Symmetry: D2
Subunit: 333 residues, 4 copies
Amino acid sequence: IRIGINGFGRIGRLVARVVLQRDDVELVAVNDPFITTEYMTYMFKYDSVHGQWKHNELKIKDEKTLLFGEKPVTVFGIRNPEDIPWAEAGADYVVESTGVFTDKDKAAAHLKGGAKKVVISAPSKDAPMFVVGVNEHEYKSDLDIVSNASCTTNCLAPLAKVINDRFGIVEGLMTTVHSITATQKTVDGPSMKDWRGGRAASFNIIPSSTGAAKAVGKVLPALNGKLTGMSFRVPTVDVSVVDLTVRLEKAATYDEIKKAIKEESEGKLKGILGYTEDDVVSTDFVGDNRSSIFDAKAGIALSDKFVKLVSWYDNEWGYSSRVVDLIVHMSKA
Amino acid sequence: IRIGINGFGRIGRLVARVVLQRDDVELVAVNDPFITTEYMTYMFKYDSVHGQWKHNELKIKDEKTLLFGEKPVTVFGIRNPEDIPWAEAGADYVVESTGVFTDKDKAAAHLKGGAKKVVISAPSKDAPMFVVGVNEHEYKSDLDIVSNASCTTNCLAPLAKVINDRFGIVEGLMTTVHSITATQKTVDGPSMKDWRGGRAASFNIIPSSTGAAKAVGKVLPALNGKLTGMSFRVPTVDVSVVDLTVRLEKAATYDEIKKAIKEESEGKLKGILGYTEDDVVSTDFVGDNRSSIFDAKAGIALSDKFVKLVSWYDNEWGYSSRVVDLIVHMSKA
Amino acid sequence: KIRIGINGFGRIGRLVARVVLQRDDVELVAVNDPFITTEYMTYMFKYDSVHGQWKHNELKIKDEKTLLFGEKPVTVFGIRNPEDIPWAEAGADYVVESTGVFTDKDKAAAHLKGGAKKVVISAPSKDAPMFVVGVNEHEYKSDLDIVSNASCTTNCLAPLAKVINDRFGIVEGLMTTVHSITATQKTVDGPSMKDWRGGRAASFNIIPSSTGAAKAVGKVLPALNGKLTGMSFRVPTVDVSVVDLTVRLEKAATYDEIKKAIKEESEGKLKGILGYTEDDVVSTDFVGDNRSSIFDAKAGIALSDKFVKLVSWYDNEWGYSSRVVDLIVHMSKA
Amino acid sequence: KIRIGINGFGRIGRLVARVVLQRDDVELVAVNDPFITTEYMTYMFKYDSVHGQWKHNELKIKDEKTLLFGEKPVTVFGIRNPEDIPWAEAGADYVVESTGVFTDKDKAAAHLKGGAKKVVISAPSKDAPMFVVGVNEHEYKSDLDIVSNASCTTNCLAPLAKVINDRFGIVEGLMTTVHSITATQKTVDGPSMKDWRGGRAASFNIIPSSTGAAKAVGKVLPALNGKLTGMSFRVPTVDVSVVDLTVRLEKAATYDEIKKAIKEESEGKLKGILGYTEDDVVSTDFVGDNRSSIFDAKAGIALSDKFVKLVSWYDNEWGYSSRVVDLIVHMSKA
Ligand SMILES: NC(=O)c1ccc[n+]([C@@H]2O[C@H](COP(=O)([O-])OP(=O)(O)OC[C@H]3O[C@@H](n4cnc5c(N)ncnc54)[C@H](O)[C@@H]3O)[C@@H](O)[C@H]2O)c1
Ligand SMILES: NC(=O)c1ccc[n+]([C@@H]2O[C@H](COP(=O)([O-])OP(=O)(O)OC[C@H]3O[C@@H](n4cnc5c(N)ncnc54)[C@H](O)[C@@H]3O)[C@@H](O)[C@H]2O)c1
Ligand SMILES: NC(=O)c1ccc[n+]([C@@H]2O[C@H](COP(=O)([O-])OP(=O)(O)OC[C@H]3O[C@@H](n4cnc5c(N)ncnc54)[C@H](O)[C@@H]3O)[C@@H](O)[C@H]2O)c1
Ligand SMILES: NC(=O)c1ccc[n+]([C@@H]2O[C@H](COP(=O)([O-])OP(=O)(O)OC[C@H]3O[C@@H](n4cnc5c(N)ncnc54)[C@H](O)[C@@H]3O)[C@@H](O)[C@H]2O)c1
């Protein structure tokens, strides 16, 4: 299980922290043209949210290798995927976490290097989409390039599946309150694709567009077309919270809904879905590695068919775990 | 129209800025035991959100009077409402904006001074509740003490009334993303009444409880029991956004909903309800004095009976305007 | 008379424009920014996170070409390359270079090829002469093809440093600045090849950052050249900074006397440039303050009467943008 | 042996407790806070915005009375008045006074009435002697009924100031601190009768704030007494501060030599107290760092070899809370 990372960013570095820590996978190659080999060293070591790394990893040679205890990782800086030699240093698995190559077409440039699989660290217009714990088994050794969906979809689908599996969802609207990301700006700046997105990120509540509810349909067909949503970017560095307003087919009191989710959190969905009854706020989930954590005391019901459910997620650390879990599930057909 | 302010806080100072600016009202008395006469001078002058004041106002005498151009305001520091002599210096109208005296019973201590009316700057368990533009006409010269509802209710009811007036609301769930307030804490501290509320305010998304949807019923009886909601406190100094997920009786496309609201914003509800199609984020509404501003591009519809609507509000400045408008409407039966 | 052009419609670009538009003695001719659509330009100008909505005007007419500011029409350019900018072809005699990427004297010169008579660089340069208004803008000479309005920080420091120097003389001085974030920073830990700490998430760190401001003062105030050095920390505020000045003086003084001295100069030659407050100010109190430097009497502290620390506030965006307009005006007369 | 009591379960209260609980050489006996319910105490201890969830333990048993920390049981008090605190009745030999409201030597003494042998004030005092670990904790003498662990800032400054002083001697020095917000500040502009700027909304202002840290150094380091003075700015970060030191030295030096000197002392007597980094650090890099002062070589700047500026990082909450525990331990031995 040799893993390469394309784009050593929030997700890429975090995914590296996760990979290097597990004993069943190994980190073979990193690519990022914008970060020099040594600089990678600094970026990996220090982190504003996740803390200084607690094991070890340094620069061995002028530009080609880092040393983690005793495992070499080679370092590339290649602007173009097709010109990444994942082959010439092993790494059957590639995490595509640049944000520019989500088109299955564009991520395939990785097959041209020596790479058996590609995992895109975002939703794709056109790549099978899997969310661990909900539809990862729909996977096949014959799918070359795949997607781990998005952090929001990963938080939503697990709650969504359980909710519909047992009470059925007539209709659903989701709102997420979400932390800022690399695509935002420190001060009002240009972002042609999304205008509300150039506004100074830590000083505004910025409405923002999210395709996750339309994505839950595409990993969970019973719900296809039955949910949609929007988002608000707000000024926290990390952690987000999903807010789902749903209409239930079968009448259910709040307490019933509560321990139906508690059960799955203990059962099939342990490690993916969590459940809490504490008075948590978002810093409480920094470093939490579940996909979704249901917040019982938070949610609210109008009537036993109409209800609002709140679930947390650490958009960076949770989603990064799931990437590794997909990859491992991949290698075991 | 002589107005006194109890508790020279965010709302009280802002309401003072609003009163002093209008020509149809006058600011007679301010009470606040925790702020000395001169200090009031400093607090009124400078403001982190609203800017330095643009007309003028200074300390005349050791502890009893401030001078605004040529109008004296007397300054009290009395811990107990019943012992405030609103009489002995005029001021028929009192804005109760301390946050400790929302009980109609407790606000009545103001009638014991020389005061014809009291306006509570918050919801009351037991005081008639009015939201300008929605039910201010249900008022009577015989109601002694009143409530201007809450900032969220003031943002919600105007959208709510229009929505139900024309398409009918079967069921509604509201979420607000809301700025932090004086009740929150800079760092994790004690708040026995609400635990998620002691967590460091500018570093968390903090779920929080709101009675506004249950309050919209109590100024708009058609909707009584047909909406509820929750809130998220987030790290912006001012401005909040209401997010309403509603189920409509009569089918309506999004565009229809849009210009049905546009119309009222131009019509009956001008100055209370606004409408925009721009890419606004919350700083865009700092200083906006409407009750509610509908954000068209933001909202979303699943189906023509199920829809999500987004409206902004400047929790401090909008609500403070409305207080003055209630008071003025009061004095004119 | 006095038509102006702006290259780089960013924070300084748009703001210098809110200024040029509010004055009578100056006109806004055209703007260039290859990264902002003509309609986007109206959105960005109109709404501002720090300085509020713009309250006079203001729309566009030409599919891509022209913006109507009230009734004045501004020509809109989306052109990468500076010499490809036909400034004159839309009579733009003065060009504000607020791009951040052409602070070189030869670099800025590309604007002249375009048919343009002067280029003011809204940022310090390695070569272009540096003038700070109220300190040495008289060295301007009509020959200077290209100029620099130096930095926000140098504008807060210099005015202040002069009064202190020209009344008690500065022997030795060290400068710290507590500065707001800027567009060069990152929302989230990200790549900053030229400055590593500067890649760290901006609104959640106190970030040591470099500044030349204390040495630039020597270049605009050759009296002081070589006697000042400093550093900065970027911190999570959207706008407004503060200068922290540690100086030793030849001429003994008290805090009261240095306080009185500053007030004097404040209404003298340096009115509107150097300000003086004795209130309990905090940084939001200075948002939209057009003065280059505001001295804060109650904040500072003294060790001796020769060893002292001096506090000056400044709105890095608005004071500086005002100053650019000022300096241009003075170059039009002289 | 070494049982400890905490008055004021706040930021310093709860954190000194995460410390006392992690060590073997010390026990946590009981806590007092009239404003926190016994069950609330577990919530507040458990979850923390800056330092994460606590990862060893930990529950309660007694309706109101007792908390189980792993298997150690802690007695919970909700009592306003210090002398009403029967500390001994629950064998608590050492009392950490982290309330903020009893920093007076006679004020702290109320704890002794309660049957308690020593009171460490987690904050500087007007009277109580001030010891800074690694600088002068040896002046402790077994007679001292009551002690002060001084301030977070004095702990960052003193260690550093000594190395500089005892190798090149400080003639004259001025200190600035860029400091994180604390519980004394306000989310929103609100009343601060004792300090007006300190009432201003904390996460949206750079706030000038006062500090005695440079003068407290003289009281713990009488070599330096009267040669340092300073100020601070509070800024929108939740934890971690940085010290800005402007000093002139009798003994000429280079930046390299002062750099080498600090490193030396860093592993010498002052290991674990004074730290030394040459990396590209920012303030989050120091969250949960238990050292009292971390010197930052790349940040600082030098004017002469007698005029220099020195940068030290510090986690005001965690370093200080570690230090309190340290000083108590040293008082148990000596
Ligand atoms: N941050 C989150 O909460 C989060 C969560 C889920 C999914 N994602 C997804 O992950 C992807 C990256 O997100 P991020 O938050 O890490 O952003 P990021 O900006 O920190 O990472 C981008 C990285 O890619 C590198 N890069 C850019 N072009 C490259 C190229 N052609 N070759 C190699 N490297 C290149 C950059 O230097 C940078 O380090 C996006 O697709 C994003 O939607 C992010
Ligand atoms: N800030 C908002 O967005 C907002 C919006 C709508 C309603 N309100 C309501 O307004 C009220 C106050 O809100 P705020 O945000 O201005 O808070 P705030 O803390 O700034 O104001 C409270 C003020 O009351 C003074 N005070 C306390 N006790 C007093 C007493 N007994 N006599 C006289 N003065 C006393 C205080 O010194 C303080 O100045 C609350 O009821 C709140 O729910 C606030
Ligand atoms: N923001 C401040 O506090 C401030 C203060 C004083 C000085 N300055 C200086 O001002 C300059 C710009 O600063 P800013 O803060 O406005 O930066 P900014 O990023 O906000 O603005 C730069 C603008 O330049 C545009 N741009 C980039 N490349 C261009 C090109 N080839 N042609 C035309 N436009 C281009 C960008 O689209 C952007 O709109 C820098 O040199 C900086 O040192 C900034
Ligand atoms: N937070 C810091 O960075 C820090 C660092 C160094 C020193 N200090 C010092 O520590 C002291 C406390 O600081 P803090 O930051 O933890 O403050 P804090 O407000 O967070 O904690 C004070 C605690 O004292 C409790 N309390 C108040 N009155 C009490 C009483 N009568 N009896 C028992 N408990 C009472 C409060 O409930 C609160 O839990 C102050 O003296 C401060 O100078 C704080």
